[model samples]
Target chain A: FQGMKLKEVDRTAMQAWSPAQNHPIYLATGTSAQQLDATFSTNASLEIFELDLSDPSLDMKSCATFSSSHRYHKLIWGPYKMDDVSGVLIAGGENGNIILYDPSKIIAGDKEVVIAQNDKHTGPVRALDVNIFQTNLVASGANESEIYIWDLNNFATPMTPGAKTQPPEDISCIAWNRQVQHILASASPSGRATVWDLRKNEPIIKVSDHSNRMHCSGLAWHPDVATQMVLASEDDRLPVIQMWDLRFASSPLRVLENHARGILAIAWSMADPELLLSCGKDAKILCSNPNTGEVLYELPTNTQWCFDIQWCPRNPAVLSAASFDGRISVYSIM
Target chain B: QGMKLKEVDRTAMQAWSPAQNHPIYLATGTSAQQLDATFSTNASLEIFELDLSDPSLDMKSCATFSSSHRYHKLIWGPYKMDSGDVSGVLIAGGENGNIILYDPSKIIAGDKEVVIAQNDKHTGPVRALDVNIFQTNLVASGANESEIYIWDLNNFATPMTPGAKTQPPEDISCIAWNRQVQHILASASPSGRATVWDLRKNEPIIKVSDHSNRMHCSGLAWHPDVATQMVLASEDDRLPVIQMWDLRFASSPLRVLENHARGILAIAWSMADPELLLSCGKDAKILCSNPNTGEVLYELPTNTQWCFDIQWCPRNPAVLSAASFDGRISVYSIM
Candidate 1:
């Protein structure tokens, strides 16, 4: 609960993982073949790699390559059962479409098929979260401040909350509480943090950190606690982390300070209820105690801006992070 | 258009006289530092009056007093107590819950201890403070406590209750007394809630809440000439809009000024120009605007790191001063 360090592994075996069960980590990389501008291209094939983390010496094997027409900002694994059956991974495209692909078929040398595509968003979809309570339910957020709830079973019909629930500013991130049913949290560029209960389709609490000139860049709820969450701020000089109790919606419970730059991702530990992991443009990963506002550990990432961090569903000590250096790392806290 | 602000030795709280060709009074202490609780040492109170009739304003030291508390608010009365007196006495609110009044002439004459009277009743920092122009002896002061106490300089112990004694939901941030109406007053909270009170009645006349819960009321200022009109600013960074409200219509704002890039910290209305208003924010820009049409007239850039407070000169319509966190006060002539 106090200390965290990345366990060294084979550098070439970097990949993603499925949240459903113990499966090989998938790595997706690509470049478009068609020239769009001097420094841009489109319609390229995505290279997929599978990494086996079960062994000490990591093994990375080439998987099926999928053709993608647009660039994606976020990629999340869809829900699936624990078995030999494969599950689809959804990618939020910059052209406003949600692309779904089954990696199981790609591993068999079969062409990647689009399982379901939704283009209801007019702007780039930057935030995506799949509900842990309902596997078929997914939330997508765009710059337009619209959060669309989609049911994979009935892709034709999506739930659009009333305009009153829309954020007044640009959406920065979205998250669903794993321990609570129908609870959602969204952050915006205006420093606004909104909590929503899908049952009522209304925001129960909305607060902003305008006093410090800080905007929320990331959000994550405690793995065990249902009514509490931590918000990461966009302020670089004073990158404060605040914990908000849902019951007392007027103010924050406490402010966690120490980050030297904007924090982009926050993940609460499932094994240790009070422990949290955060990474950002500072190129360092921090392990902190949300209750005491104390940072217990810091891990250097060779100066790469970390964009994402997530705890393994099965192992609390095992963590994965994505960086701007085009590398996905698997870390094990000893 | 721009003039260098003289950096005071310490953070200063200032108030200008309502009379024409009058000097401005300034008080400096550690109230701001105490509020942040970052400094360990106690600071003494230093008062001064600046005469701006000449090209180079002459700053004359007034009175200085050493105490355990710091002064948070300062205001000058409109009329003198007697015909022989030079000017009205200066009333200052202390961080330790005391209100002290100083004779202006005695302080100007370099009296080391010139406090005429004191009211020690507040238990916390007197943040919400204002003086009624119509009732010179009537002063309102509030802190983290539930009830706002109205004091009569003549009788200090027994204070008059303006409204119900019920405590507000949040700590008061700022308060203002209507210059035109003796019974009208308003107070703002950090939770973006505002209440308007009519001293004649024992209840609030109206209460205004921000549409967004994420917003906090940072600053409030009443119209210098109108009793029913006032402006409010928010701490919302994305859309740090300033709202103009009329007491007649209690539900919505008449116009919204949205030029500020960050949360506004202070607002001041021009005493001479009814349509002219000035606002400063954390964004380091001072905006002069017309509240009626929501049009920005002048956007003056102050390279100050962070502006905490601002006020327009009571006698001059074009002159204004901004207090910054960088230990300097910048004065500008916008016309």
Candidate 2:
């Protein structure tokens, strides 16, 4: 894939490629809303922009906008949606609620775009991932050691805790298995990862760094490989993303290093399986072939830390990176 | 398949002495680890006197010395030192981004610091070094920096010339002087490109990134007979293959070697035998192969757990040495 385009946006470090079909060229991004107390009157905005890279001047025309209580820690799209109708925009709220935005309501110019607010964890929900295989399944995690499996069909009561016995606290990241419909992986900042099979309460497997190093911040599962997944460490001393095959938990199968500082986030492409996107505190975005651990291409370094990154599931070559420099750039990987 | 000639308890980053006589010597240094707490930033240069008349592979630590400076990236001077005195000048890159010249005999004789000279121009840690094959007076060094500095042995304090563009937004991995062309040099980077430089012109003339786009190069070896040909090795597990590139066309590789199961750290093209090539890496396997056909000719049977550096004996084509992360140095025989 080849890279394309450069644009600017608000003080946001969170973005997601649109999962909706008609909104295939759209991107969802919003402010980090970190300083929520002072900016209470000036609430955060959740926006969707339709991009046009073909134009002489790069254009990101705002398609939809909604007022949020505050900036979300994470955002994802619910799998269930109409063919032409926009899907449910899931955002992990700053105050522990999972806010669902109805783009249909926003189209009718409704004041309240938030269709449902699931307030389960009263603090902050920083991790969210919707299962592709199971359309109704959505997993959300908080730093307070609680990970809840949310069912989109039944919002309030159809819930399950990932691992009730002893789930890791300070949850840095969580993701559903691309191949396994019911499997979920949750990880802490301490380099410990627990793979949960939502079928039963017992933990299927537990993996941790052998050297007792690496402060992990991101995780991605192989699009097609059932037993393989990737984890990233945010420790400056360990600026590498490790590809781990579930069988050989002791040592990583492949370790990729290019980022100067700790990586903040990573996204594995479900479309090609070869493309892996990683952005770091070094303000750099690298597109690498995870299978071979070779960098396919890299975006020019931004001046500040890049908090999050993602690849377009539909477009394949298009990707986005949200950085601390108060800008979110969408690039196309040619 | 080659015999395990001999082994020692030092992580030998060895450089063979140029002396053309028996009782041949090897200057070995410790390869420090970022994880190993004891000497993570420190390393010592050890002079080993080797006796290879028999199959026993007998050797002795003739002299061992180190200063307060970090000697992790180091090598022996181009010329041989006194056989009796072990008075070779050791050229080493420092951890603090400096360069130091050392005389082991003085350090062995009660002198605390045997530094002949110190060059501190590089702002980052100097990781790679190479001395000119034709003119021993010319030595070049590079850090995780953009440009490579060619320094004169006569004036070790400052650089004689620079061989690159400041356009290096990328850090360097390794360096080697062209064996055929005396004035040409090559340096590899994590960007998967090995820039061939014309030292006389003071600018990079060619960029060979045949194995491009994320498969970075950790080590490279210029062809012994053909100046236009060289081999590049990846430093990651994804594709542990060494690609031979002809500088004339950087679009594709001339040949590819894939015997090592892990990232290859260092490689050597035989000066005496043009058909022979040597390499070692994270796979902990050292192999001698035919560079033309990409066939493994000899595999040394020992797992030192990630050998870092290997070299063919400049005077003897039959003898070769390698250093491992396990603090063991092993010598091998090809014939």
In the predicted model 2, the residue pairs found to clash are: A1-A334, A2-A333, A2-A334, A3-A334, A4-A332, A295-B213, A295-B214, B1-B299, B10-B327
Where is model 1 more than 4 Å wrong at Cα? A1-334, B1-7, B18-27, B33-40, B53-63, B79-85, B167-169
lDDT of 2 by residue, A210-237 (tens): 3266878788889899989999987777
* Candidate 2 residue-wise lDDT, B1-335, digit = tens: 67667778775456777645345668776553333545465567767777775566668777777656655477766542333255356788766578877775564454566667887787577778887878877888887657578887776666865553557367767888888778788888876677777767676655566536648677787778876788888877787888988653343464678888888877877888979888886777777789898898877776557766777887778878877665667787777
Chain A only, candidate 2, TM-score: 0.91
Clashes of 1: 1
Identify the candidate with maximal lDDT: 2
For model 1, residues A128-192, the per-residue Cα lDDT tens digits are 88887787888888767778888887776788543544434556688888688788888776567
Docking class of 2: incorrect
lDDT (10s digit) by residue, model 1, range B1-335? 44543345456666655564246655555554433335555655665565555455435556676655566776666544443234666667776677777666665566566667777777766777777878877888776665588877777668886787545345667888876778777888776667777787666655675455667687788877766678888877865878887653333464678888788877887767878887887788878889878888877667757776677766666667677776665666775
**Distance (Å) between predicted and true CA of B214, model 2?**
41
Full-model lDDT, candidate 1: 0.67
Error of 1 at A169 (Å): 20
Off by over 4 Å in 2: A11-13, A35-42, A81-84, A165-168, B1-335
